[PDB]
Design an enzyme around this catalytic site. Structure first.
Site, PDB file in Angstrom:
ATOM      1  N   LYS A 117     -38.452  10.365 -13.624  1.00 52.04           N
ATOM      2  CA  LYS A 117     -38.957   9.329 -12.410  1.00 52.04           C
ATOM      3  C   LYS A 117     -38.748   9.820 -10.646  1.00 52.04           C
ATOM      4  O   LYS A 117     -39.753   9.445  -9.869  1.00 52.04           O
ATOM      5  CB  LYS A 117     -37.509   8.693 -12.312  1.00 52.04           C
ATOM      6  CG  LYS A 117     -36.805   7.773 -13.319  1.00 52.04           C
ATOM      7  CD  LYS A 117     -35.607   7.817 -13.315  1.00 52.04           C
ATOM      8  CE  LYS A 117     -35.058   6.689 -14.571  1.00 52.04           C
ATOM      9  NZ  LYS A 117     -35.585   6.542 -15.952  1.00 52.04           N
ATOM     10  N   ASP A 134     -26.919  15.726 -17.997  1.00 52.26           N
ATOM     11  CA  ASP A 134     -28.060  14.664 -17.689  1.00 52.26           C
ATOM     12  C   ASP A 134     -28.758  14.790 -16.596  1.00 52.26           C
ATOM     13  O   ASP A 134     -27.763  13.442 -15.323  1.00 52.26           O
ATOM     14  CB  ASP A 134     -27.686  13.456 -18.621  1.00 52.26           C
ATOM     15  CG  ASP A 134     -28.940  12.871 -18.770  1.00 52.26           C
ATOM     16  OD1 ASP A 134     -30.190  13.364 -18.224  1.00 52.26           O
ATOM     17  OD2 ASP A 134     -28.333  12.198 -19.762  1.00 52.26           O
ATOM     18  N   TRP A 184     -26.257   4.422 -20.638  1.00 56.09           N
ATOM     19  CA  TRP A 184     -26.714   4.216 -20.314  1.00 56.09           C
ATOM     20  C   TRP A 184     -26.882   4.756 -22.691  1.00 56.09           C
ATOM     21  O   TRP A 184     -26.284   5.472 -23.390  1.00 56.09           O
ATOM     22  CB  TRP A 184     -28.324   5.720 -20.419  1.00 56.09           C
ATOM     23  CG  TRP A 184     -29.718   5.367 -20.982  1.00 56.09           C
ATOM     24  CD1 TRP A 184     -30.187   4.505 -21.454  1.00 56.09           C
ATOM     25  CD2 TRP A 184     -30.287   6.848 -21.693  1.00 56.09           C
ATOM     26  NE1 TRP A 184     -31.250   4.693 -21.464  1.00 56.09           N
ATOM     27  CE2 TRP A 184     -31.474   5.723 -21.597  1.00 56.09           C
ATOM     28  CE3 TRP A 184     -30.158   7.867 -22.099  1.00 56.09           C
ATOM     29  CZ2 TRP A 184     -32.621   6.987 -22.757  1.00 56.09           C
ATOM     30  CZ3 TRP A 184     -30.956   8.526 -22.584  1.00 56.09           C
ATOM     31  CH2 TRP A 184     -32.213   8.193 -23.031  1.00 56.09           C
TER      32      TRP A 184
HETATM   33  C1  LIG Z   1     -29.330   8.964 -17.673  1.00 54.00           C
HETATM   34  C2  LIG Z   1     -30.719   9.193 -18.598  1.00 54.00           C
HETATM   35  N1  LIG Z   1     -30.853  10.209 -19.288  1.00 54.00           N
HETATM   36  C3  LIG Z   1     -32.600  10.441 -19.960  1.00 54.00           C
HETATM   37  C4  LIG Z   1     -33.421   8.907 -18.933  1.00 54.00           C
HETATM   38  C5  LIG Z   1     -34.622   9.535 -20.501  1.00 54.00           C
HETATM   39  O1  LIG Z   1     -35.599  10.683 -19.430  1.00 54.00           O
HETATM   40  P1  LIG Z   1     -36.330  10.293 -20.416  1.00 54.00           P
HETATM   41  O2  LIG Z   1     -37.776   9.359 -20.290  1.00 54.00           O
HETATM   42  O3  LIG Z   1     -37.274  12.163 -19.612  1.00 54.00           O
HETATM   43  O4  LIG Z   1     -36.721  11.175 -21.872  1.00 54.00           O
HETATM   44  C6  LIG Z   1     -33.045   8.349 -18.226  1.00 54.00           C
HETATM   45  C7  LIG Z   1     -34.227   7.335 -17.966  1.00 54.00           C
HETATM   46  N2  LIG Z   1     -33.212   5.917 -17.353  1.00 54.00           N
HETATM   47  C8  LIG Z   1     -34.244   4.067 -18.024  1.00 54.00           C
HETATM   48  C9  LIG Z   1     -36.124   4.380 -18.459  1.00 54.00           C
HETATM   49  C10 LIG Z   1     -33.867   3.124 -18.375  1.00 54.00           C
HETATM   50  O5  LIG Z   1     -33.004   2.661 -18.215  1.00 54.00           O
HETATM   51  O6  LIG Z   1     -33.794   3.150 -20.456  1.00 54.00           O
HETATM   52  C11 LIG Z   1     -31.850   8.509 -18.397  1.00 54.00           C
HETATM   53  O7  LIG Z   1     -31.309   7.304 -16.992  1.00 54.00           O
END
Ligand SMILES: Cc1ncc(COP(=O)(O)O)c(CN[C@@H](C)C(=O)O)c1O
Ligand SMILES: Cc1ncc(COP(=O)(O)O)c(CN[C@@H](C)C(=O)O)c1O
Lengths: 396, 396
Positions: free
Chosen positions: B246, B211, B130
């Site tokens: 989520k 994470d 990410w």
């Molecule tokens: C690995 C990972 N870390 C953090 C987050 C962020 O979470 P918060 O909303 O709690 O700050 C996501 C969300 N993944 C989605 C939203 C994406 O694909 O952008 C994630 O997939």
């Protein structure tokens, strides 16, 4: 890795709150915290807020992410509150607002934005100021310098000292102004004095940063924004950190705004894109519930009217307490004239008590103020006033 | 001051979302975003959440500030979810949790805490990861390095390449692990492989940072925490960024946690004091509503049971979509074997489509995925599956 980490020092604000809870005396009096209290001693949820939350409960069908700058209406209502309906700034689209987690989040977003995208190195704050300003700016790598402000003899704005002080500020330094209801002193510039600061700042090349924590607690929503507006009339560029914590009673929901103003709409949009990257690298996007309450109150005629009265009631109850404070001190025998409290604004006043005097008020009398002499006027009520003032009188 | 600020580049995630809304075609299909969608295409509020919000509406009597680390119960329930009831870590009081504005806020609080109170200079993340990880760590002044992860031929975890890669990590570097449901690949380590990474990391002297964005979306709440638990069994020190975005559908309320673990209770408390200063200098204290929903769900037998079923339903619907995806591709004539999708976990899978293939899927077919080939499996439904797979088949 963590074996040798130095402890964060104490924290007197929590230290005070702790000592206050564990105090097993019946008539203890807290004037040491940063929130409003009503005649009963409580920090209640506003009726307008409760009605907004009901409506959100019944109508929300998703909690999907807000954009990085938050709810569009929130920003729009924020901009009107700050700049006034009709503001050329708004007409010309020179202002972009991001919803933030509180006023503090707004200061931090501003701090990161500046540290990363400008040559800003330094921020000037009043002596004294609220102590979080310093830590926010220091975290983004910004030096903090102090400007003179308070006149300790006269319990007044030492205006000559303030101007003299700020001549040391270079072109391209930030100068932080409390928009109204100065924390911790309660002492604000007059309109004539704001107008003069606005002229000086364009001449010296300062980026103004306004912090509005208590809009509506001095004289009224619109009056309290006059200083900011005199600056807005004069400047191509400024930043405003605002909070809805005190004026909606939404402390724990973290409802604030960072508003960026530039010479024109092309420029603010470019700059704002980088303000958004700074939010992105921090908490990603802001918390909906609190800001949603605010937008639903501000954009509804009926709820807004209810909320404006509630805000007016808080402001007036503080004003009645300022007056009951001075009147009760005169008649419990006080060896000073405290009528300077009446001219002070918002929740806070520098009482002029010494650090030893406040320490004594705590130990002998269970009356709790901050070490500087800051009192929360909303902590006073008609019931605790007599003994509050007796205790003070005894320590003078 | 703002005249010359460079624009933040595009942003394809928003760029994609924009292009997706303005797409005036009836059968457009979004697989490009980061949130869950149900069989209907919506991101709904969970029933458990709605019940919790009603209860909060009727029982809250103040919005007074939470402490810097947030609601105590929230932290306690967070720690059990991560480490299991009975965890020695919890018994020995080696873990402190701060409520944060989302998982991102948690990563940022961790990043600031480390940059300021340790010698940490560098964080290792998977290639791919990410893309927000990089910006969060870079903002606190941390270098980001990549470790190998994905095997592009076999759509698998290239484990030899991962280990080989991380031998370049020095004692005192952070190594970020996705606890489960890797973003963007859907590919997680087996327990045997987690156990091996745990051994390597104590030998090499890495600070593990987990994470957890999707706990409960791979196999179950407890199963999905096994990797983290194998590390916990081995290490004196680690940090966990978790998100309830989520798994409670609370995206916009910013509900996360930063959990700090040290050798002992004296040490974690000292370190945690500085983690709190890092929160203080940022957003001051965290937003109540979302975290309050979570604590009220987790600590109530009835609501927790309802919520666990809701979470199980989301996990299973994703699992049925993975299977319907592969089965439909075989029977619409696909020139590859996609059964690797079944072994992938959570909302995301690397489809293995090329950037040109995804571009074509958008322009010719109104099927939207991310440039890397990331698809959101929850974006698939029984109704859009046939045409989704036809379109893919046509581009292969
Ligand atoms: C690995 C990972 N870390 C953090 C987050 C962020 O979470 P918060 O909303 O709690 O700050 C996501 C969300 N993944 C989605 C939203 C994406 O694909 O952008 C994630 O997939
Ligand atoms: C000048 C000033 N700026 C910012 C804030 C913080 O607002 P947020 O809650 O929106 O971040 C306060 C609150 N003053 C109180 C709370 C104090 O005395 O600590 C303030 O007085």
């Amino acid at each position: 890795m963590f074996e040798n980490i130095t402890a964060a020092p104490a924290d007197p604000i929590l230290g005070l709150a702790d000592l206050f809870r564990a105090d097993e005396r019946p008539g203890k009096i807290n004037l040491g915290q940063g929130v409003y209290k009503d005649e009963t001693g409580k920090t209640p949820v506003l009726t307008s807020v409760k009605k907004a939350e009901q409506y959100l409960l019944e109508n929300e069908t998703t909690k999907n992410y807000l954009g990085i700058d938050g709810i569009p209406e929130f920003g729009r209502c924020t901009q009107e509150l700050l700049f006034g309906k009709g503001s050329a700034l708004i007409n010309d689209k020179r202002a972009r607002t991001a919803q933030t987690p509180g006023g503090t989040g707004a200061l931090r977003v501003a701090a990161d934005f500046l540290a990363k995208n400008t040559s800003v190195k330094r921020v000037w704050v009043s002596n004294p100021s609220w102590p979080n300003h310093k830590s926010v700016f220091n975290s983004a790598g910004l030096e903090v310098r102090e400007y003179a402000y308070y006149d300790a003899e006269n319990h007044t704005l030492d205006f000559d000292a303030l101007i003299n002080s700020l001549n040391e500020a270079q072109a391209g330094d930030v100068v932080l102004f409390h928009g109204c209801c100065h924390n911790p002193t309660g002492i604000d510039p007059t309109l004539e004095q704001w107008q003069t600061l606005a002229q000086l700042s364009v001449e010296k090349g300062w980026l103004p940063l306004f912090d509005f924590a208590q809009q509506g607690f001095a004289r009224g929503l619109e009056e309290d924004a006059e200083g900011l507006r005199a600056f807005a009339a004069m400047h191509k560029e400024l930043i405003v950190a605002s909070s809805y914590s005190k004026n909606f009673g939404l402390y724990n929901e973290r409802v604030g705004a960072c508003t960026l103003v530039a010479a024109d709409s092309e420029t603010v949009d470019r700059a704002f894109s980088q303000m958004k990257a700074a939010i992105y690298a921090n908490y990603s996007n802001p918390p909906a519930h609190g800001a949603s309450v605010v937008a639903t109150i501000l954009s509804n005629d009926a709820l807004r009217a209810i909320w404006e009265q509630e805000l007016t009631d808080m402001r007036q109850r503080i004003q009645r307490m300022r007056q009951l404070f001075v009147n009760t001190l005169q008649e419990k025998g006080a060896n000073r004239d405290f009528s300077f409290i009446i001219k002070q604004n918002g929740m806070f006043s520098f009482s002029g008590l010494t650090k030893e005097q406040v320490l004594r008020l705590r130990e002998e009398f269970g009356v709790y103020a901050v070490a500087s002499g800051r009192v929360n006027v909303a902590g006073m009520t008609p019931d605790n006033m007599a003994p509050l003032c007796e205790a003070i009188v005894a320590v003078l």
